[PDB]
Structures are given as structure tokens and as C-alpha cells.
């Protein structure tokens, strides 16, 4: 969460684009949370290594 928050803040400060600020805070959690969907067919278990 702090990695995403810092990324969003630095993008907003650097490129001064509010649209460029809305994209990451939703895309990155969407990709990371939605990542396991393909993992279902693999049937691996989240662990310390994961």
C-alpha cells in the first residue's frame, strides 16, 4: 500500500497530470488482486516464497 501511495504521489508531482494520477491507484491494485485468477488453473498455494 505504501509503495502504491508513493508511486501515485510521485507521478502527480512529476507529470502534474491528475488523469495520470487516477490510473495507478486503481490499476495496480486491480492487477495485483486480479493476478491470482489465472493462478487458479495452476493450483499453487500462496506461501512465504509467493
Amino acid at each position: 500500500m505504501m509503495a502504491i501511495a508513493l508511486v501515485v504521489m510521485i507521478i502527480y508531482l512529476f507529470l502534474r497530470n491528475i488523469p495520470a494520477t487516477i490510473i495507478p491507484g486503481v490499476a495496480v491494485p486491480l492487477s495485483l488482486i486480479g493476478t491470482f485468477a489465472v493462478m487458479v488453473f495452476l493450483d499453487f498455494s500462496i506461501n512465504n516464497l509467493t
Partner: protein, 495 residues
């Protein structure tokens, strides 16, 4: 960069897996050979009174006796626990040091703490830093030659704290029934064995059946009334004449020495030897010291050796590494040639990979971090990011060269000028991504703390070399491509 890559790869200390502080410590308690249940129990009670006094420890778990885990009657295994992260004040090293110097003061006791780990590969739990096995052919010969390897192998400076799980000073009582004297009263060896077993054998004979459970009936003899080995001759044995015949008239009693445990390897008697290597010597010095000792002792020709653990893991890693690197480099050459449809462009991309290795190895040597296989993976990811930004600049360089047709030097100039901002956003993203691993101070941090420093060193070294070397070396590779085109023309002309 290439030469220092080889030099540092040889110079950096390596590691197999790292140690972790989850909060439990497993220790083993050792007791003299003549130990019994009362003595071992009272000693456990005294230690439990001593270890619990420490503020960092919160509970004890200890079970002794004959089971599938404990090794002997006098040998006790302890499972110590600690408070979680937010309440105690010191880490695993200092807490275990305080625990070890706390019990040493206690008389008559000795306890071997080894901090337990999470991922275990060895089938046994080690006691000291290293352990190995010695294989022989017979119990008696290896038993009689056990003292030689304690009294002659202990004095090598490279080899310290020599110890083995086998102890051959155990007290055993022997009864010698006379074969000729037994035939006079009509008693056989079977009667003697049955009498001794049902006298002092804790024999289970009868069964109790209940509504739902099943209890057992056990036979035991009293020893309180008559202390000492004088309890053995009070047992009687039946006779054909009908009377009772004492064991004194048909047998004699002797005391001898037998081992408390027999351990076997490959259908031959074996010893497991564990010890500590001095930090001033490496495992190579230790194993060569074992070599000259086993050569000098003039051991029986039926004494061989076998080792396990770090040596096998490191040999397997060495066997796998060269083939892994060769196959990987071939794979990158193939895919990059597919992406660029050229011969020397992938070599231009492949030439920037080793630069990150120098930074990673320099950082890990400076950071004093163990080079576990996780560190090797981190170096691999560093090289991957380096090749990622390298491709980022080269793609636009080639696109500009093919579109504008401008000379290559101004082409790479324009490509670098239009792609510089991507370089710093990527670098900042990598720096913020590696920042948590640098300041990781929580649970499991031993498995992420060195990675941050390694990645940060790899990244800053890689960008410092990239931003100032890539364009001109790419122009030099284009000049070499022109010379190879000259070579193609020649090989088509005079060949």
C-alpha cells in the same frame, strides 16, 4: 567490468539458505551414562527452574522417555519458546547467547541449543555447526577404535570440539546361567528368560475389555524395599522337584559395559560425528585435516567416511550453475535475434548484462550479506531490469535509424534525449521498490533484508555504467557490424 565480474564472483562468500528468527529454540540435554528416571527428571526440574528465570523466555515444553523421537533414556530434547516481536528486546543471536551462558553456570548439566529453521532439507536436526558420518564394518572394532579418534583427532587446530553421538561407557548387568546346572532341576533357558522378563521387564500380559475403551494389565516388581542390584537375586524360579531354587545357585552375576544406542548406516555400524569449524578456517581446511588425520591414525582398512549437507548442496549448485548460465545466454541470444532480425544487435544487448553483476557483488561484499540463492535470484532480477531499460533505448534507436535515416551518432543522440525521462522514472520506480527491502525490520526480515541493499547497489552501478557507456559502445558495435559486412563481401568475393 568483465574481469572484475569474474574476480568478484570468485571472491564473494556464498550461502545456501538463510537463518530466520520465528521465536522457538530446540535444545538437547545430555546426562551421564549412569543416568536413570529420577535423576534425569530432577535435573530437568532444576534446568526448568533456571531457564525460566530469563525475561525473554515465556514457556517450556519438554518430554522425555522412550519414544519415536528421543534418542535415549538420559537424552532429553527441549523445545523453548520466546515472546513475539513487539515485547522482547533482543534478537535470536544475543538471546541464545544469554540462554547458553545462563545454563553453563548450573552444575552437572550441559545443553546444546541450535536455533531451529523453517525450510529444512537434512533428515536430521544438527547439533553443532557441521556433522559427518564414519562407516565401519563391525560394532566391536569401531567401538574399540572410538577412543583413538578422540585422543588423536582432537589436537588439530583446524578441527575443534570433536564429539559423536555414540558413547560406549554404559553400565550393563550380566547374568550367566549355567547350562549344566540347569539340567539338574529340570529348568531350561526358556524358564530363566520368562522369569527374568516377568520379574523386571514391565511385561504386558493380560487385557481389560470395557464398554468403549480398552485398558491393559501390566506386571511390575518393587525395587523400593531392596535397593541396589540385590533386588535381582530375590526372584525365584520353578523346579521339577517342586521347590524354589535361588538364582545364586544356578547363575552368576557380572557387570560389563555396553552402548546405550546402536546406529546403523548402509547395513554397517556407523558413528555420527559433529563439531565446530573455526571461523579462521574454511570447510576445505577441515575436510583436508580430516583426510590427513584418518591417514595418520592407521585406522583399520574397514573404516570409511561419508558426509552430508553443505558440501553436497554446494557441489550440486556448482554443477547446475554453468549449464544454467549457458542455456540462459543461448535463450536470450535466440529471442533477441528474433526481436531484432540481426546478428550482432543481441550481442550488443548481451554485452550490458555483466555490468550489474559487478555492482551486486560489490554491494554484497560491502553490505556483508550472505550470498544465499535468493541473492543470486536478486542479481538475476537486477540483470533483467538492466536488459529491460537497455531494450527500451535500443528499440527507439533502431526505429529512429530505420525511419529518419539520419547518421547513427545523432540517431542515438535523439533516441537518448527522447527516452531519458523514461530512464529516470524507471530508476525511481526500482529505487522505491527496493526501499522496503532495505529497511525491512519485521518478522521474516532475514529473508528480505539483504535483497534491498543488493538491488540498490546493482541498480545505481548499472545506471551509472549504462548512461555513460551504452551509446558509444553501440556505435562501436555498429562499426564492427560494418567490418563484418566487409568480411561478408570478402567471403563472397575471394572464397
Amino acid at each position: 567490468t568483465l574481469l572484475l565480474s569474474v574476480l568478484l564472483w570468485v571472491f564473494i562468500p556464498k550461502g545456501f539458505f538463510p537463518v530466520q528468527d520465528n521465536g522457538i529454540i530446540q535444545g538437547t540435554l545430555q546426562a551421564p551414562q549412569s543416568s536413570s528416571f529420577a535423576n534425569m527428571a530432577q535435573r530437568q526440574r532444576q534446568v526448568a527452574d533456571v531457564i525460566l528465570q530469563d525475561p525473554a523466555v515465556q514457556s517450556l515444553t519438554s518430554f522425555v522417555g522412550v519414544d519415536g523421537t528421543n534418542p535415549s533414556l538420559n537424552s532429553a530434547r527441549l523445545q523453548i519458546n520466546l515472546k513475539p516481536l513487539d515485547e522482547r528486546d533482543d534478537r535470536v543471536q544475543k538471546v541464545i547467547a544469554r540462554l547458553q551462558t545462563a545454563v553453563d553456570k548450573v552444575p552437572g548439566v550441559d545443553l546444546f541449543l541450535q536455533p531451529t529453521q523453517d525450510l529444512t532439507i537434512d533428515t536430521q536436526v544438527s547439533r553443532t555447526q557441521y556433522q559427518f558420518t564414519l562407516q565401519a564394518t563391525s560394532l566391536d572394532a569401531l567401538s574399540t577404535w572410538v577412543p583413538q579418534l578422540m585422543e588423536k583427532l582432537q589436537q588439530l587446530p583446524q578441527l575443534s570440539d570433536v564429539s559423536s553421538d555414540w558413547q560406549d561407557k554404559g553400565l550393563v548387568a550380566y547374568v550367566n546361567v549355567d547350562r549344566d546346572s540347569a539340567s539338574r532341576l529340570g529348568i531350561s533357558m526358556a524358564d530363566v528368560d520368562n522369569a527374568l522378563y516377568n520379574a523386571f521387564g514391565q511385561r504386558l500380559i493380560s487385557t481389560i475389555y470395557t464398554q468403549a475403551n480398552q485398558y491393559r494389565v501390566v506386571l511390575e516388581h518393587n525395587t523400593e524395599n531392596t535397593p541396589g542390584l540385590a533386588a535381582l537375586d530375590t526372584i525365584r524360579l520353578t523346579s521339577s522337584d517342586g521347590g524354589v531354587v535361588p538364582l545364586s545357585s544356578i547363575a552368576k552375576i557380572e557387570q560389563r559395559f555396553a552402548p546405550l544406542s546402536i546406529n546403523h548406516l548402509d547395513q554397517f555400524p556407523v558413528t555420527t560425528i559433529s563439531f565446530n569449524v573455526p571461523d579462521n578456517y574454511s570447510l576445505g581446511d577441515a575436510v583436508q585435516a580430516i583426510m590427513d588425520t584418518e591417514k595418520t591414525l592407521n585406522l583399520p582398512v574397514d573404516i570409511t567416511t561419508q558426509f552430508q549437507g553443505s558440501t553436497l548442496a554446494f557441489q550440486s549448485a556448482l554443477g547446475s550453475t554453468v549449464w544454467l548460465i549457458v542455456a540462459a545466454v543461448v535463450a536470450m541470444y535466440i529471442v533477441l535475434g528474433i526481436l531484432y532480425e540481426s546478428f550482432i544487435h543481441p550481442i550488443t544487448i548481451l554485452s550490458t548484462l555483466p555490468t550489474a553483476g559487478v555492482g551486486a557483488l560489490l554491494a554484497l561484499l560491502i553490505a556483508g550479506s550472505e550470498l544465499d540463492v535468493i541473492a543470486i535470484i536478486g542479481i538475476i532480477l537486477l540483470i533483467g531490469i538492466v536488459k529491460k531499460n537497455a531494450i527500451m533505448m535500443i528499440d527507439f534507436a533502431l526505429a529512429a535509424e530505420r525511419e529518419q535515416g539520419m547518421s547513427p551518432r545523432e540517431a542515438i543522440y535523439q533516441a537518448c534525449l527522447l527516452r531519458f525521462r523514461p530512464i529516470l522514472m524507471t530508476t525511481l520506480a526500482a529505487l522505491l521498490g527496493a526501499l522496503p527491502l532495505m529497511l525491512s525490520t519485521g518478522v521474516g526480515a532475514e529473508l528480505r533484508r539483504p535483497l534491498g541493499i543488493g538491488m540498490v547497489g546493482g541498480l545505481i552501478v548499472s545506471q551509472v555504467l549504462t548512461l555513460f557507456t551504452t551509446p558509444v559502445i553501440y556505435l562501436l558495435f555498429d562499426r564492427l557490424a560494418l567490418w563484418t559486412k566487409s568480411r561478408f563481401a570478402r567471403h563472397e568475393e575471394e572464397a
